[PDB]
Amino acid sequence: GPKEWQENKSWNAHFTEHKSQGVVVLWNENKQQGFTNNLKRANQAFLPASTFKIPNSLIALDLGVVKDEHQVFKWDGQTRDIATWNRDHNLITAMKYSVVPVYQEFARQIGEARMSKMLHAFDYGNEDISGNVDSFWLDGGIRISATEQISFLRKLYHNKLHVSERSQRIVKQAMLTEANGDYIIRAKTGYSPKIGWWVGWVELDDNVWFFAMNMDMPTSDGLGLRQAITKEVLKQEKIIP
């Protein structure tokens, strides 16, 4: 009989076309079956980098560190490399522009004790916050695989995480990336030395496709490949036109 995770190695052509390697993991919610080009890499755990903004947002909201998605967090005045960071942000734009210093302040206000407790409740990756509370997802001990990202995202989609429904709805709003008459994408990118991420889902009229992809990234060039390669897989599988 059929397997929970089916391997489709033909997607490697989309990584090969761009002289890269990685994994795309898809989960068809209606069919309760998953698909990936590399079963092994689907289960390899990596630093989450900026994809950690999803659980960080949930915890910050549930504890009231963030009151709502409209609350303004003033620029601390320090000019950083990414120009979109040097301005005031709310939760919506802090996600969209992946504004690390805003999220570092969230993490410091959450604190290590509550951060560890929440990640355990979320069953998130290896749950290891060793390092600094404001950088463990960038250079500390936490590791999460693409399949673990799917499991976490499915809980979020269904409001099943151990935080309020409100917190989950707000974060899903903040994840909005693209919407048209054909589909809605809610997702979060990430990048740390040598690995780029894109995780999220595609909402259709009568199904949801969760996705988690990571790929080798020798430099910061080709960050757009994260979405481009994923979309090539989504197009091949007739999920988007």
Ligand X SMILES: *C(=O)N1C[C@H](NOS(=O)(=O)O)CC[C@H]1C(=O)NOCCN
Q: Give the nearest residue (CB) to ligand X.
A: 50
Q: How many residues bind ligand X (CB under 6 A)?
A: 9
Chain centre to alpha carbon of residue 32: 21
Closest approach of a second copy to the CB of residue 183, in Å: 11
Cα 71 from Cα 36, distance rounded (Å): 39
Separation in Å, CA 77 to CA 80, 101, 107, 163: 9, 11, 19, 33
Q: Are strands 33-36 and 5-7 parallel, antiparallel or unpaired?
A: parallel
For a second copy, the binding residue among 205, 219, 220, 241 (CB under 8 A) is 205
Residue that has been written with the tokens 């090969």 in this structure: 16
Segment 23-52, which members bind ligand X (CB under 6 A)?
A: 49-50
98 catalytically annotated: no
Counting beta carbons within 10 angstroms of the beta carbon of residue 209, is it exposed (0 to 12), middle (13 to 18) or buried (19 or more)? buried
Binding flag, residue 164, Cl ion (CB under 5 A): no
The active-site residue out of 50, 98, 145, 167 is 50
Q: Which stretch binds Cl ion (CB under 5 A): 76-84, 94-102, 147-155, 212-220?
A: 94-102
Closest approach of a second copy to the CB of residue 39, in Å: 30
Q: Which stretch binds ligand X (CB under 6 A): 6-14, 105-113, 119-127, 187-195?
A: 187-195
> Which among ligand X, a second copy, Cl ion, none contacts residue 103 (Cβ within 5 to 8 A by kind)?
Cl ion
Our CA angle for 39, 45, 47, nearest 5°, is 140
- For a second copy, the closer of residues 41 and 53 by Cβ is 53
Q: How many CA atoms lie within 13 A of 73 on its CB side?
A: 23
Instruction: Annotate each residue in 84-113 with x if it binds a second copy (CB under 8 A) or - if it does not, as one string.
Output: ----x---xx--x-----------------
Cα 184 from Cα 192, distance rounded (Å): 26
Q: How many residues bind a second copy (CB under 8 A)?
A: 19
- CA dihedral of residues 87, 89, 94, 100 (deg, nearest 10): 50
* Tokens encoding 83: 């120009």
For ligand X, the binding residue among 39, 92, 176, 223 (CB under 6 A) is 223
Site residues, ligand X (CB under 6 A): 49-50, 98, 100, 138, 189-191, 223
Residues taking part in catalysis: 50
Site residues, Cl ion (CB under 5 A): 50, 100, 103, 173, 176
